[PDB]
Amino acid sequence: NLVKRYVAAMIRNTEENFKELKQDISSFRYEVLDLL
Amino acid sequence: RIPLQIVRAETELSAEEKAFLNAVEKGDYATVKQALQEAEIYYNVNINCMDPLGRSALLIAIENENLEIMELLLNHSVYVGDALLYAIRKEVVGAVELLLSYRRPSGEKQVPTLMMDTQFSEFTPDITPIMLAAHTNNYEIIKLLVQKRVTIPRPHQIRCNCVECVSSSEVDSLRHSRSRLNIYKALASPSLIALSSEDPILTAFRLGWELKELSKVENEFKAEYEELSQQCKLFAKDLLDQARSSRELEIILNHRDDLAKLKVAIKYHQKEFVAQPNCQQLLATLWYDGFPGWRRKHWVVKLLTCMTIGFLFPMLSIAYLISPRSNLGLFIKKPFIKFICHTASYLTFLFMLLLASQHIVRTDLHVQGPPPTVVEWMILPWVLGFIWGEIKEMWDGGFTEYIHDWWNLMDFAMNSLYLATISLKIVAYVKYNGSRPREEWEMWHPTLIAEALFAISNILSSLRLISLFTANSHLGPLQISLGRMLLDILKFLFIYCLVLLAFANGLNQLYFYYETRAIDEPNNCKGIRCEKQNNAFSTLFETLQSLFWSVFGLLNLYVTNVKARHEFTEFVGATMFGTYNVISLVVLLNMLIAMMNNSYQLIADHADIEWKFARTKLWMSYFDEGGTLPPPFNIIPSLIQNQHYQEVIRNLVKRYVAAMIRNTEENFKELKQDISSFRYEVLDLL
Amino acid sequence: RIPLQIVRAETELSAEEKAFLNAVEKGDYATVKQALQEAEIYYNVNINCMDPLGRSALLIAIENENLEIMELLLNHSVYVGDALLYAIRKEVVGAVELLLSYRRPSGEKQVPTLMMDTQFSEFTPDITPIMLAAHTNNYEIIKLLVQKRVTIPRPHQIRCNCVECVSSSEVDSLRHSRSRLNIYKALASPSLIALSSEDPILTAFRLGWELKELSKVENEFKAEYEELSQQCKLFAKDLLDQARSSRELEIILNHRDDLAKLKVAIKYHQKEFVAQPNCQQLLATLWYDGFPGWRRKHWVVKLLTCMTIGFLFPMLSIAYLISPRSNLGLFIKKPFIKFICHTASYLTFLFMLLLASQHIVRTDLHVQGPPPTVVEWMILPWVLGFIWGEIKEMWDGGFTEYIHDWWNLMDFAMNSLYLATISLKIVAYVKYNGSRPREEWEMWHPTLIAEALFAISNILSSLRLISLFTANSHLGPLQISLGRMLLDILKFLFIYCLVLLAFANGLNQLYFYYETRAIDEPNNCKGIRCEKQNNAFSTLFETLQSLFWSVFGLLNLYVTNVKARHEFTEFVGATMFGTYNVISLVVLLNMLIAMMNNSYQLIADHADIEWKFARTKLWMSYFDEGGTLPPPFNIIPSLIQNQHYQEVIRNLVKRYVAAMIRNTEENFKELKQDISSFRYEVLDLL
Ligand SMILES: CC(C)CCC[C@@H](C)[C@H]1CC[C@H]2[C@@H]3CC=C4C[C@@H](OC(=O)CCC(=O)O)CC[C@]4(C)[C@H]3CC[C@]12C
Ligand SMILES: CC(C)CCC[C@@H](C)[C@H]1CC[C@H]2[C@@H]3CC=C4C[C@@H](OC(=O)CCC(=O)O)CC[C@]4(C)[C@H]3CC[C@]12C
Ligand SMILES: [Ca+2]
Ligand SMILES: [Ca+2]
Ligand SMILES: [Zn+2]
Numbered sequence A: 001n002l003v004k005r006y007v008a009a010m011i012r013n014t015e016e017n018f019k020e021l022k023q024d025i026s027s028f029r030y031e032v033l034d035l036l
Numbered sequence B, C: 001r002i003p004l005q006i007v008r009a010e011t012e013l014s015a016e017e018k019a020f021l022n023a024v025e026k027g028d029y030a031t032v033k034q035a036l037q038e039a040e041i042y043y044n045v046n047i048n049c050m051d052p053l054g055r056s057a058l059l060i061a062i063e064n065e066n067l068e069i070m071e072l073l074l075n076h077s078v079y080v081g082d083a084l085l086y087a088i089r090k091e092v093v094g095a096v097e098l099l100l101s102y103r104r105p106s107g108e109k110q111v112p113t114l115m116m117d118t119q120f121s122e123f124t125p126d127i128t129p130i131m132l133a134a135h136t137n138n139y140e141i142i143k144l145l146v147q148k149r150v151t152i153p154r155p156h157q158i159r160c161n162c163v164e165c166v167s168s169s170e171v172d173s174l175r176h177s178r179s180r181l182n183i184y185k186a187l188a189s190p191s192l193i194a195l196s197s198e199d200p201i202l203t204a205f206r207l208g209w210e211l212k213e214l215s216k217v218e219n220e221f222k223a224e225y226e227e228l229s230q231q232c233k234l235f236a237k238d239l240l241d242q243a244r245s246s247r248e249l250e251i252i253l254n255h256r257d258d259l260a261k262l263k264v265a266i267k268y269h270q271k272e273f274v275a276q277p278n279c280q281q282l283l284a285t286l287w288y289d290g291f292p293g294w295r296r297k298h299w300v301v302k303l304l305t306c307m308t309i310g311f312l313f314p315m316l317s318i319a320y321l322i323s324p325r326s327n328l329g330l331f332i333k334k335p336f337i338k339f340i341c342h343t344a345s346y347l348t349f350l351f352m353l354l355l356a357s358q359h360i361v362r363t364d365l366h367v368q369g370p371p372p373t374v375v376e377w378m379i380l381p382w383v384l385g386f387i388w389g390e391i392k393e394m395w396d397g398g399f400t401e402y403i404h405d406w407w408n409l410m411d412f413a414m415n416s417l418y419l420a421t422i423s424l425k426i427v428a429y430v431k432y433n434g435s436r437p438r439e440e441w442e443m444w445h446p447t448l449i450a451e452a453l454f455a456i457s458n459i460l461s462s463l464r465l466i467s468l469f470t471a472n473s474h475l476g477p478l479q480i481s482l483g484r485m486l487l488d489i490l491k492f493l494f495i496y497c498l499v500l501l502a503f504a505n506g507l508n509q510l511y512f513y514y515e516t517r518a519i520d521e522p523n524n525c526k527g528i529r530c531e532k533q534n535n536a537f538s539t540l541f542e543t544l545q546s547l548f549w550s551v552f553g554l555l556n557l558y559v560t561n562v563k564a565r566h567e568f569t570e571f572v573g574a575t576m577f578g579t580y581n582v583i584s585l586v587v588l589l590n591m592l593i594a595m596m597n598n599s600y601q602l603i604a605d606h607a608d609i610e611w612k613f614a615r616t617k618l619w620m621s622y623f624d625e626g627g628t629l630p631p632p633f634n635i636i637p638s639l640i641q642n643q644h645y646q647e648v649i650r651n652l653v654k655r656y657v658a659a660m661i662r663n664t665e666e667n668f669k670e671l672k673q674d675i676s677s678f679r680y681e682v683l684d685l686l
């Protein structure tokens, strides 16, 4: 029980991240243009 | 090598359940809807299935803030246990609204039966949703919970000795401590105080005092109780800071259950509330009641006015006695004139004590019981006025408040010394008639004891002037740091007294066989106070005095030498004295320097606030009419207020809520979730 | 009231130009394309129009990273001046590629003529694109610029006295300083050093040394030159840290133009490069050459081996003399045995100097010129060996390197003292024959002067042991902090010497009339070194000695009293002495304590690195074969390396580039721009 609670606590508690959002927006933009 | 295995069994999720949880994580509404519609007909997927990290489908919907997937999972009657706690901790208003509003409609046939999902809960089982919402400090969720008729349990007294508190502490102390800390954390939130208290300032003051007392009592949980008290004090100061007019500030300060709320804040030690700039401006305006534009003036005219009003001490007090309703008698009732007159009276008393120690007045010292000189006859009314003022301060305000000042101990000591010297003088006058010369007087002569007590009282009277340093703008924080470093000096002096007692015991036990009489030694003296330093380690008192005086270097090195040629005993005593000198001059004093240095750095940031608090405490001591006369002259023989306070607190609470609303990897996950959900819906529609 | 007006005329943008700039800002491609297509036919909008903030349409396209709008604005032949600088500062690889590649094709009829756009440039006119790319530290843009045959101007020497440097400094010093700082900032980038230098470590070392010397010279721009030197040193340490094998580390350290590169790093004061952990491990392995697993052992066996090898000092040096190729003679060539033998020899010399001051050897003190005792006859070979070792150290390494150690000054002083005492002893032996008693000797007797110089040399020899503190792991940073605080003590002692000279001048000028002869005073002595303290302010030297001794409290208070009853002069002198005591004991010493306290806090963070640098400098002093014998016994009569270094530096540069690539409101504006451009294109298509 202590290990489960500690794992929940540690899960609960940068330029790579924004690149994901640019990548997700760019991939959605190309697929929308390709389908349309 | 080392084999590695999963020690604790986590059941693996099936392919359909893993695909369903992945679809819920990616926010694909159509696939999740298809899986939910296929779940009832075929029973393939347990909708309440968990993940490796302990989240269910509903918790994954709550964490990503997908309201559509949240309501869709709610429409198929998934397990909903403790999801409101996760929504409240996530501070999502829409999720809390959905979980509050959907639990009531369309409940049919109990709930569908489910087993073995309920072991893992991130939130503690003692927690309730209103308490966790109070801990989160979110306003909208607290408001929505308070609208639905929700209550919180009342904590007991800290010194509670009833059967149920003692039984809960004995059976499970950890659960009781966690429940009390959670309840006080819920009660200390600014939003709950603003929403569920008709007097937020007084409630914040009482909660801060109770949290400080609990931190003083509970040793294990001191830090979070101190944090809660600081949060309550900052909430009170922030609510006071939101005022917009002088009338609102005077309505807030003068509200009663003149400045009653300021006195209540001072009684609860709310330094941030007292040291706010607008309250300081109002106290400065009240302090300079009869002197408008005091801050404007060049310092020469201010000092000239101070000199001319301090030199006019013997008038303006008899004028108050003879005509209190006259124009001249009304100027003494202002606080600045009262403080200047009291300072002038104390300076006159100090100057008279300086003048009493001169050869112009003192004559014929060879009288056993001397009559009091005219300087003493005039000084006696000041001592009587000080006695009457101290006893009046003991009566008014109560005996429980007279002892908390900590300056009254010196006043009690000074009054005791004056009473002792007066009694010794009167007894020496009454029954020591004669003119015997002073060289053959008894060592226990009451005249000498009376003069020694008079000198000690004169030292205490001259050292009483440190308390006036709060009035200046430069000597206040200096004495605040001095007060903290005095406590650190006491903490040092305990260990120093222990080391001094140990070394004095050793030195006396070694050296008390070689004691010599005063007749054998030169000049008929015995001690460390001779021209030639005599036996310094012959007695315990003499050893203590000699070890005390060695710190300042006033004790020579030949005190460890004996008459006989006992070289080993002399070397052992010299080693003892050297070890004591090395300790008390290389370790202890430098450690005291290091301790008071560290303390000053901590003290400086807070030095102003406490200086302003001390100056406010000194200023309101002169506001009342009790004690208008100086020490030389004090012995000479309504619901509209509550409605306005409620209006001002209402506007202040609205402004503070607007200010606090105006003033991480979870966030970007929302943007990935919003982009992913929009991408799936665009692909599905197209 | 106060009127407010636009003091400096910014021309207002028209409606069409403002709409066009707003459309370019929002990323709407179709509206911008329509406006550009309508611009030529109707001439309505100046495409090179500016904004209120100084950006054009092309700069707005570059800042939002809209490559489509960027190429569309390029296709209509807009002004392109200095846009490559904005692209390089924005670190956009695609924008730099587009601006490099589009400037060449389709240039027809010069450029279209445009006026009055060219005044406002954020980048300075001296700047060039390769230099700004070097300042930005981006790798891809630097690579693309270097591929197109681009060069950078060479900075001159710091001590340059040519006509053009002096003329540029006299005509415009600010432009010259900015150009030199920009050039050195371009040359100090890690990417340019990795791309355009065949030896990045040596280039970084030379650039760091040049930047440190420029920071020492240029007073105005010290901080950025120190930052550039720190950046070069950190680049060198980071490139050294990327190694993966011991062979690569030994190839890097042993590369020449044995450990040549380590010596070059020590010569350039690269403390971070020397104090790297792998180089420290290699130096520890070389240091414990014959003792494998030295760190493994319990401390008793290590101390026993140290005692048995230090007590075996007189053997293992004659063994090296008689059989250097034997098994026993080869053990002295290891560095640890060399250091232990030298420490044992110096400890033996110190113990012999202690033994020379005993009554067992010294006999018949009433001889004028005494022959040297047998202890002195044996001590003389150690002094000769020290002289030969110091002169050998002067010859080998050069006179320009012998003076930078700062420990050689004490060795020079010790050798001078030994030569002076030997010359005084030999002259006293040769021409002072007799047995006159010591009580009637001349004050300038060479025997007494020789003994005083011998005592001072003995003090210097005993205080020479501080330099061995680098060998231990606990006494190294302590003496590093001691070395910094000694410089701070010198900075204090300058002001103390000035104050002491002033007060000594005043005291001597006041008190030198009351000088008395030695015959009149008791015991025939004159000075502060009597039982009764004589005239202490009679001469300048005596006044200086008395004011020096008053700091430690060894000067009594009755030295300011004169024979006659001149109360005013005595009071003035007492006030003078009291003011000097208050200064030198209340202000100066406490200020020195505060200064050395602050210094220690700064010193502690860097204390290890410099301790490791000092220990590395001490360790490699014993690596060479010059000075194998102790002081008592030293007077007894290839392109594959470059190819491997290039391979290792190649792999290190690739690993460092990968590491640096692996390790704000502009960013969110990209996401708003990408979402806005996608929204307009979806609306346009639909
Ligand atoms: C320096 C030597 C000669 C000893 C002096 C002893 C006393 C004559 C001093 C010690 C503390 C002094 C007091 C420190 C601070 C103030 C407050 C000062 O007024 C303010 O700071 C204005 C603001 C306010 O208090 O309302 C007026 C003088 C007074 C009473 C001073 C009067 C003179 C005092 C009693
Ligand atoms: C404490 C009193 C009695 C004075 C002692 C004076 C000397 C006998 C001391 C002063 C400094 C000492 C030295 C300080 C440090 C070292 C390094 C130490 O070796 C290490 O620290 C191991 C690592 C290495 O140096 O390679 C061996 C002893 C030695 C030479 C010490 C030998 C004894 C020394 C010369
Ligand atoms: Ca009182
Ligand atoms: Ca040397
Ligand atoms: Zn109870």
Ligand SMILES: [Zn+2]
Residues within 6 Å of the ligand: C156, C157, C160, C161, C162, C163, C164, C165, C166
């Ligand atoms: Zn030049």
